[PDB]
Design a protein around this ligand. Sequence first.
Ligand SMILES: COc1ccc(-c2ccc3nnc(C)n3n2)cc1OC
Length: 124
Amino acid sequence: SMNPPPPETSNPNKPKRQTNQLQYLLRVVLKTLWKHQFAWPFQQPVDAVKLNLPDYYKIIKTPMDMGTIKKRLENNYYWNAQECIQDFNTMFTNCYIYNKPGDDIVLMAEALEKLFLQKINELP
Ligand SMILES: COc1ccc(-c2ccc3nnc(C)n3n2)cc1OC
């Protein structure tokens, strides 16, 4: 059960813009979630081979992680702030999909999602 390549993070042909919303998403949202005690399973793509999770990429067809989001923000990959917010939401929902209600990893993702929402509440 091979891992897929990680999501694309840079496209020099995509037009680029700097907005207050995108700057906040990197400098506040991504930065704060990265430093959360429970962030470490979400800082890079799920390595289903190393973790012995052969069904991970049979269930999760839209993988996402904070390492990918960080790169997308740095590379001006997002034009709309909603694209970034959607990626964070895909990351949390993937965890809820693969796992089950009450699992430790689900409770960790729920705590990160609650911090995300406290930070997004304050978006420009
Ligand atoms: C670096 O180490 C790890 C990295 C990730 C996981 C892990 C396991 C199941 C799962 N379901 N959704 C997500 C996200 N994950 N992440 C576990 C790790 O070590 C035990």
